[PDB]
Amino acid sequence: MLSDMSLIATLSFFTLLPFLVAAGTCYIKFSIVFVMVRNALGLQQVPSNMTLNGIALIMALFVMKPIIEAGYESGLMEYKQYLKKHTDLELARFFQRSEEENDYSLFSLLPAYALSEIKDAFKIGFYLYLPFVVVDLVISSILLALGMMMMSPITISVPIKLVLFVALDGWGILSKALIEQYINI
Amino acid sequence: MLSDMSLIATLSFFTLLPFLVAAGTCYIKFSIVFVMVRNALGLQQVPSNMTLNGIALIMALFVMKPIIEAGYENYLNSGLMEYKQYLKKHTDLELARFFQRSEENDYSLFSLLPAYALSEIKDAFKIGFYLYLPFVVVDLVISSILLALGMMMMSPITISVPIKLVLFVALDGWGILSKALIEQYINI
Amino acid sequence: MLSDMSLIATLSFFTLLPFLVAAGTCYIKFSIVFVMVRNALGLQQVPSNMTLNGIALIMALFVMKPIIEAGYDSGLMEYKQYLKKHTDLELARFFQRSEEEAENNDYSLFSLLPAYALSEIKDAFKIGFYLYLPFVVVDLVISSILLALGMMMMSPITISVPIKLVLFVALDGWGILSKALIEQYINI
Amino acid sequence: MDISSWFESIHVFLILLNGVFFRLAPLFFFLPFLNNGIISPSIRIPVIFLVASGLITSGKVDIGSSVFEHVYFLMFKEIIVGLLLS
Amino acid sequence: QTLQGELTLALDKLAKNPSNPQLLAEYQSKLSEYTLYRNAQSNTVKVIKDVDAAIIQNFR
Amino acid sequence: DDWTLSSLSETFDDGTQTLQGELTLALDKLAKNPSNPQLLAEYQSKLSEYTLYRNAQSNTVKVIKDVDAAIIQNFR
Amino acid sequence: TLQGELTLALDKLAKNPSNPQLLAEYQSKLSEYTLYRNAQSNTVKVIKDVDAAIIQNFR
Amino acid sequence: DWTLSSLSETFDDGTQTLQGELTLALDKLAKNPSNPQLLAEYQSKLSEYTLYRNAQSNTVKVIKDVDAAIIQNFR
Amino acid sequence: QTLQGELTLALDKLAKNPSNPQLLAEYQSKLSEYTLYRNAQSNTVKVIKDVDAAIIQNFR
Amino acid sequence: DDWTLSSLSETFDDGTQTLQGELTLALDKLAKNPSNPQLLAEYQSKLSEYTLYRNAQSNTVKVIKDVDAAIIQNFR
Amino acid sequence: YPVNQVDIIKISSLEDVVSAKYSDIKMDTDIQVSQIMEMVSNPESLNPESLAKLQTTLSNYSIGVSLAGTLARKTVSAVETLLKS
Amino acid sequence: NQVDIIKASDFQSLEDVVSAKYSDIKMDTDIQVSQIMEMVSNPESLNPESLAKLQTTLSNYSIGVSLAGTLARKTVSAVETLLKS
Amino acid sequence: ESLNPESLAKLQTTLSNYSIGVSLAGTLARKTVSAVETLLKS
Amino acid sequence: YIYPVNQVDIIKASDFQSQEISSLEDVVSAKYSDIKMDTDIQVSQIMEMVSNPESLNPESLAKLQTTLSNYSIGVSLAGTLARKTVSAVETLLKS
Amino acid sequence: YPVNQVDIIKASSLEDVVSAKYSDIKMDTDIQVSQIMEMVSNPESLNPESLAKLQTTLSNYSIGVSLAGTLARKTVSAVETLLKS
Amino acid sequence: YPVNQVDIIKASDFQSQEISSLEDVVSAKYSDIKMDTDIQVSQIMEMVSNPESLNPESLAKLQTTLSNYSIGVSLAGTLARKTVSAVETLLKS
Amino acid sequence: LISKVILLENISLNYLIQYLKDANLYDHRYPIRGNISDKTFYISGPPALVELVANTATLLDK
Amino acid sequence: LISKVILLENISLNYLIQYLKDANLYDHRYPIRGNISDKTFYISGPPALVELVANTATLLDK
Amino acid sequence: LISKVILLENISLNYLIQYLKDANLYDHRYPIRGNISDKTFYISGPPALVELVANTATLLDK
Amino acid sequence: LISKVILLENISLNYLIQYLKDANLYDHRYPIRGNISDKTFYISGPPALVELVANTATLLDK
Amino acid sequence: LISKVILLENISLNYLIQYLKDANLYDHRYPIRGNISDKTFYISGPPALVELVANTATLLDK
Amino acid sequence: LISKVILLENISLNYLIQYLKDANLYDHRYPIRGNISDKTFYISGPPALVELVANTATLLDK
């Protein structure tokens, strides 16, 4: 059984659960990184974004297991500690000042964590784009120096980028690196 | 507490709450600015719209805290006057004057709310255009360099994204932008 | 009929069916291979993407029929055996380490599915790279012929499409490709 | 009871709002600041209806005498005038 | 078998001798108990099946 | 199968049938002469038994009808 | 035939308002008719409700 | 023809001569309330009339209840 | 003539003579008929109009 | 139309008006001297008619209110 | 007012086929609606048997109209999905 | 609660009209509730005439409030459906 | 004070017609606007 | 033929029409026909129970209630599962 | 046990305010539940006046809880509508 | 057949041993919930079946048990629907 | 190929066998099994013959 | 091809056979099977003849 | 292979064995396990035999 | 391998053991644990044997 | 590994212990803890033995 | 670590202590604290021992 008002609160939290996950956990970094990789490879919608989002969701569940289990057996403090150790405190302090005038309110921590995670994900995406941009420019230079003023390099760079990503093992090693950075601490 | 008429009014107002928030608060400006910046980066669907909308909603809640507090103190357990004053502070005079009936202080939020919405849209678009400038600068520089090298069959979209991301990361981007918006909407 | 909790479980499983197929049921390989072939042939919308998805779904259902039949703990065990057959075990062990806290157990379901998905994506990219080679060879040969002729402003892709299509028809193309994939993913 | 009259008046007002929205949507399409690539569909429609409500309550909307019987001619006239205005 | 059989036996005894106070009291007790049992069983089945149906309604 | 309302009424009628014959015979004999104490006592006993039988039959039919109606309502 | 039986019982009761056996038979027939009508209406209501609920899910 | 007005008309017309017998007995009783035969006839007619009225009202009520119960299953 | 007019006539006759078995029975019958008529008409109109409205909601 | 509830109550009241005055006068006369058989019979008749009138009025109002409530619920 | 009792009474191209079927089904629905209105308007039908018949007719009409609308929506959506994408 | 007629009414701000109407109806409902509470609290209104008047007032209040609630719900639902998609 | 059952039934029918008309007009306007956008796609 | 229902008559070696079902289409058709036959049988049984003026005892009414509830639950569950499957196919096919 | 109504109180961050209000409402509902349970369990509050007070308290509690649930549902629906599209 | 009714358990068959993997946790919790609802169903069926359970106290206990079962099952269904809806919303891209 | 075990209450097995032989419906290839004294018989054969036997067994009570 | 087993109650099989033969409705290709003394008969043939036999058997109970 | 344990009331096991032997249906490959004293037996064999024996035992009581 | 503790009312353990021995349904590898004096026994073995013993024990109290 | 506190109501603890020992089911490694005079005992061991003891304690009330 | 306060109704504390000592279930590291005259005691210790004491106290009433 459960209490009356506690039931209302639990139902409200579960109703807001998808948006809270979308704006309050590691799902942001995984989703952004995978979409960036897909765009970098030059493919339009081949990787079937449902698959990428599902993989990101499972990885987020793996990351959130300790905090979820801590709250399952007052995990709010643990969640606040996680956010505090994975955000920039200057933005949190500014949002705290946006109120009346080391508590770090949960409402003041969510935007800071979201923006910091988005910035980190963009940095990771830039780090990812470099080899593919190099491949595209190299093949374009080779084609142009050969004497061809046509046959856009994007019709030939796809196999080279794909084989490079296959040799690198790509997705597996990238996911291992991300999850090692996040949970293996 | 709410015998048989305040209950009906409160339920009706809470049912119209989604549209009232989406067309009578600061949410419009933040949503438009975030979407325009995300489009200016060259991306299409890299950050999900749910994340940006949630951030905008939280920022709107932060901005609307005093008026929400006053309304909860008065009605549920004067807030309309505070909301009207907020709209007057954050509207354009010309739009309100036009929405006035005819024959040459504007009130009647019925006729003031559309003016507020249009002013918010205009200001958000101005901010988006301001933020578009460095990214279009990077795009044009890349295009000019590519044309100079002699290659023309490849669009600068492939190379513009990493440089735009680098510029936004170095600028710190989202944090300073949100701070600027909150400072604009909170002076006292 | 069914009990109260078993009804909830089966309804939830059927609700999550599209995402369970998306997480990987050999449908990922078929879909990616077909879309990559469409891109390689120089076509953008002709093969009616929904048709490719439909035939890929039919092939995936044919492959999954032994699992479904042997299902109805038997179904879960058979699914895990199939995954272990068609994944890279090292990533599965790494995800087991990430989930729990080097061991030797059967495996973990939540720790095996992403590994299978990533291995399937890697294999799909491998087969796509194998497929692109004759088409890019034809494109380069035609480009060289056109350039050696003397024309400088003739786009090779304007004329490469019929030759690529006739080569793919002579190879018999889609039937042989489907046979190869189903032989990869079938026993005996 | 006057509640019936209130309901009738509100529904007539909503019909007029629908007409003004019919006229305004093409304008909201052919306009590259409120383009439907930067404003979400959950924000565009309420804004359009609020603008329509303000315009009609300001007494700046002209109405004739419902001359044409068939409403389809009226609908197509409104659509074509909206396209011309956009 | 117990409740329904006893009710039928009491009904037959009352039908043969509809004037004995002991028979009247026993028949009253058995009839009331049977009515209560049937009402309780019907309500319980109705509640269980209503819950089962309402589970499906949430998933459509 | 034999628990319908008509079945209950038939069971009540058949399970007590000689009583009605005795009652009508007593009524006829009373009409012939209304002064015999033995006849009066017998008629009183028979009339009381008949009244009790009718009341019991009606009450049982009503109770079973109510139960059946209660079971029906759960269909909705 | 239940309608006809009820009609005959009602006509006989109209003829004799005070006959105990006739009153009991009329009571039994009326109660059976009421129960039958309610059962039939509820059953058809349930069947049609299920049939309409099938469509309501797909729209 | 199982309406309510038709049902009431059937119930009334099924017992019509009894009403005339009752009113004749009532006038004769008003003439003098001392004839034992008159008293017995009046008692019998009054009891039968009361039973008829109660039966008619109860039957109409039951039929109306059934008809109302049918209506609720229109949706 | 119409049912409501006949009901009004019966109501007036009952009001003039508040104690008469025949008037009481007729008024009871007519009131019950009017109640059934109104309930049936309202339910039928509701069903038809709800189907008509639900036709639109599929497209939106 | 006059099918309101207050209108029905007014109709029932004003339609039967002399009866109320007769009942009041009979009650006062009875309170003066409660020993006349004719007065007692008249008082009994008036009281019975008043009780029947009140019961009929209340039942009619309840039925009309029930019909009005039933129609309202079918709006949505 | 009186009603008689003892009285007894006694193909082209595809587009035309579609039009004929549409007209026939519209006429059938109109006839059903008219019969329902006739049954509900007349107070002589307020009997349990006629009420049950009216309930069955109303349920059948509702099911038929809802099914026709749903099928039409499904067909239009199928055309939209085939062409627009 | 008076004997007056209000002719030559106005024949020649929408938020003002809405607020005025809402205040009027709220005042009417509140005075209805207060009137019935006063009439029921007095241990001297327990007579058939006053009881009948109380029944009429209570029934009218219930019917009016229910109708207002249903109409408001329908209006709000219509607006929400208009502004939803 | 018009809340007699006949007035209630007429009001029910009229309000149902009003709601159906409003919904139909809104749906038609939305469909036409979406049609124009689809024709002028991209 | 005539109404009597052969009270004491037991079937043995009932027809099974083996018809090897190696094809998946045959299995699907057989299962669909079987479930349709089962639900038609339940509808026939409930119609027979409500038609006879003998299901007026508490036992018969309870049996009818249980059968009606089981039929409703089964049909609703089958419809929900079919909707879930077709929605899954639509979602997968639409990218 | 809770004090009688003869003792009256005097002068009694966004997230902190929300949590304080939530705890206050939760405690009020819990104390109402405890009071009604105590009144029912005790076989001494069976006088008609105490029963009427219990009825009023129970009705008010039900209305308040239902209103709070409905308002919470409206709020979460508003957030879902804003963010989903 | 009859319940023992005089028996208490110490160090029950599960003491949170080998509950490391998340999948095992989910399976164990699902099995526990299924067993709890099954024993509740068996209890209520036994209560309604026995004619010797028609007492006011017995009826009140049966009502409380049935209400608790209904509330628990409805809450579980609602929570499962909310979870799957959240997953759908996240994965709809 | 179907079989049925049927219980006849007012007719012995010999009567049914004689009736079927007289009507030329009985075929001496799939005989009816069961002792003549008792009244519970068994029959296995093609669907038409088994259905005929069942119908004539359940339609010989009047 | 329809086959039925029909039992008569207030009429004998011989009367039905004579009526059909005299009414020019009997067909000497699908004769009725059964015994004259018994009251249960078997009729197999085209649907028209079988339906005619069934209707004339159920409409000859007076 | 199907195995069942059955209990008859009005007929001893010897009567059932004699009936099945004289009906030319009993087989000496799957004999019934039972004691002549009591009336509870056990039959294990092919589905047709088990079903036939069970239903002829439960249909032998009149 | 199943195990069941069974209680019988009207029959002693020795009678059941003798019945099983005379029916050739008892094997000296999984003996029925229990006491002759008492009436509660314990049977553990293959599922067929356990089902047979349980059904016999619950079907001998006729 | 489980433990159970069992309250037998109409039997002696020593009688149960002797019955288990004579049935060979009792194991001299997890003895039944408790007092002979009292009627509540404690049994700790593997699930098979614990379930056996519990069922034989709740099945020896006659 | 679990601590409980237990009120036994019809058994003295010293009797329960003697019972536990006899059963060898009482160890002198997590003892039962209280007054001998009164019938309410406090027990704090490992979950198994605390549960055992509580249940053997609450189940010792019969």
Coordinates of N, CA and C in Angstrom, one line a residue, chain T:
Chain T
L1 N 12.7 -35.6 -9.6 CA 12.6 -36.2 -8.3 C 11.7 -35.3 -7.4
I2 N 10.5 -35.9 -7.2 CA 9.5 -35.2 -6.4 C 9.3 -35.9 -5.0
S3 N 8.9 -35.1 -4.0 CA 8.7 -35.6 -2.7 C 7.4 -35.0 -2.2
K4 N 6.5 -35.9 -1.6 CA 5.2 -35.5 -1.0 C 5.0 -36.2 0.3
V5 N 4.5 -35.5 1.2 CA 4.0 -36.0 2.5 C 2.5 -36.0 2.5
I6 N 1.9 -37.2 2.5 CA 0.5 -37.4 2.3 C -0.1 -38.0 3.5
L7 N -1.4 -37.7 3.8 CA -2.2 -38.2 4.9 C -3.5 -38.8 4.3
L8 N -3.8 -40.0 4.7 CA -5.0 -40.7 4.4 C -5.8 -41.0 5.6
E9 N -7.2 -41.1 5.4 CA -8.1 -41.1 6.6 C -8.6 -42.5 6.9
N10 N -9.2 -43.2 5.9 CA -10.0 -44.4 6.1 C -9.2 -45.7 5.9
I11 N -7.9 -45.5 5.5 CA -7.1 -46.7 5.2 C -5.7 -46.6 5.8
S12 N -5.2 -47.7 6.4 CA -3.9 -47.7 7.0 C -2.8 -47.8 6.0
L13 N -1.6 -47.6 6.4 CA -0.5 -47.6 5.5 C -0.2 -49.0 5.0
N14 N -0.4 -50.0 5.8 CA -0.2 -51.4 5.4 C -1.1 -51.8 4.3
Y15 N -2.4 -51.4 4.3 CA -3.3 -51.8 3.3 C -2.8 -51.2 2.0
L16 N -2.4 -49.9 2.0 CA -1.9 -49.3 0.8 C -0.7 -50.0 0.2
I17 N 0.3 -50.3 1.1 CA 1.5 -51.0 0.7 C 1.1 -52.4 0.0
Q18 N 0.2 -53.1 0.7 CA -0.2 -54.4 0.1 C -0.9 -54.2 -1.2
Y19 N -1.8 -53.2 -1.4 CA -2.4 -52.9 -2.6 C -1.4 -52.6 -3.7
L20 N -0.4 -51.8 -3.4 CA 0.6 -51.5 -4.4 C 1.4 -52.8 -4.8
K21 N 1.7 -53.6 -3.8 CA 2.5 -54.8 -4.1 C 1.7 -55.8 -4.9
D22 N 0.4 -55.9 -4.7 CA -0.5 -56.8 -5.5 C -0.8 -56.2 -6.8
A23 N -0.6 -54.9 -7.0 CA -0.8 -54.3 -8.3 C 0.5 -54.1 -9.1
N24 N 1.6 -54.6 -8.6 CA 2.9 -54.5 -9.2 C 3.3 -53.1 -9.5
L25 N 2.8 -52.2 -8.7 CA 3.1 -50.7 -8.9 C 4.2 -50.3 -7.9
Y26 N 4.7 -51.2 -7.1 CA 5.7 -50.8 -6.0 C 7.0 -51.4 -6.3
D27 N 8.1 -50.6 -6.2 CA 9.4 -51.0 -6.5 C 10.3 -50.8 -5.2
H28 N 11.1 -51.7 -4.9 CA 11.9 -51.7 -3.7 C 13.2 -50.8 -3.9
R29 N 13.0 -49.6 -4.4 CA 14.1 -48.7 -4.6 C 13.8 -47.3 -4.0
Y30 N 12.5 -47.0 -4.0 CA 11.9 -45.8 -3.4 C 10.8 -46.2 -2.4
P31 N 11.2 -46.8 -1.2 CA 10.2 -47.2 -0.3 C 9.4 -46.1 0.3
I32 N 8.1 -46.4 0.6 CA 7.2 -45.4 1.2 C 7.6 -45.2 2.7
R33 N 8.2 -44.1 3.0 CA 8.7 -43.9 4.4 C 7.5 -43.6 5.3
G34 N 7.5 -44.2 6.4 CA 6.4 -44.0 7.4 C 6.3 -45.2 8.3
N35 N 5.3 -45.1 9.2 CA 5.0 -46.1 10.2 C 3.7 -46.7 9.9
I36 N 3.6 -48.0 10.2 CA 2.3 -48.8 9.9 C 1.3 -48.3 10.9
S37 N 1.6 -48.0 12.1 CA 0.6 -47.6 13.1 C 0.0 -46.2 12.7
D38 N 0.8 -45.3 12.3 CA 0.3 -44.0 12.0 C -0.3 -44.0 10.6
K39 N -0.8 -42.8 10.1 CA -1.5 -42.7 8.8 C -0.9 -41.6 8.0
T40 N 0.3 -41.1 8.2 CA 0.9 -40.1 7.4 C 2.2 -40.7 6.9
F41 N 2.3 -40.7 5.5 CA 3.5 -41.3 4.9 C 4.2 -40.3 4.0
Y42 N 5.4 -40.6 3.6 CA 6.2 -39.8 2.8 C 6.7 -40.6 1.6
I43 N 6.5 -40.0 0.4 CA 6.9 -40.7 -0.9 C 7.7 -39.8 -1.7
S44 N 8.9 -40.3 -2.1 CA 9.8 -39.5 -3.0 C 10.3 -40.4 -4.1
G45 N 10.3 -39.8 -5.3 CA 10.8 -40.6 -6.4 C 10.5 -39.9 -7.8
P46 N 10.5 -40.7 -8.8 CA 10.2 -40.1 -10.1 C 8.8 -39.6 -10.2
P47 N 8.5 -38.6 -11.1 CA 7.2 -38.0 -11.0 C 6.0 -38.9 -11.3
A48 N 6.2 -39.9 -12.1 CA 5.1 -40.9 -12.4 C 4.7 -41.7 -11.1
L49 N 5.7 -42.2 -10.4 CA 5.4 -42.9 -9.2 C 4.8 -42.0 -8.1
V50 N 5.2 -40.8 -8.0 CA 4.7 -39.9 -7.0 C 3.2 -39.6 -7.4
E51 N 2.9 -39.3 -8.6 CA 1.6 -39.0 -9.0 C 0.7 -40.2 -8.8
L52 N 1.2 -41.4 -9.2 CA 0.4 -42.6 -8.9 C 0.0 -42.8 -7.5
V53 N 1.1 -42.7 -6.6 CA 0.8 -42.9 -5.2 C -0.1 -41.8 -4.6
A54 N 0.1 -40.6 -5.0 CA -0.8 -39.5 -4.5 C -2.3 -39.7 -4.9
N55 N -2.5 -40.0 -6.2 CA -3.8 -40.3 -6.7 C -4.5 -41.5 -6.0
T56 N -3.7 -42.5 -5.8 CA -4.2 -43.7 -5.1 C -4.6 -43.4 -3.7
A57 N -3.7 -42.6 -3.0 CA -4.0 -42.3 -1.6 C -5.3 -41.4 -1.5
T58 N -5.4 -40.4 -2.4 CA -6.6 -39.6 -2.4 C -7.8 -40.2 -3.0
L59 N -7.7 -41.3 -3.6 CA -8.8 -42.0 -4.3 C -9.2 -43.3 -3.6
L60 N -8.5 -43.7 -2.6 CA -8.9 -44.9 -1.8 C -9.8 -44.5 -0.6
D61 N -10.0 -43.2 -0.3 CA -11.0 -42.8 0.7 C -12.3 -42.5 0.1
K62 N -12.9 -43.6 -0.4 CA -14.2 -43.5 -1.1 C -15.3 -43.9 -0.1

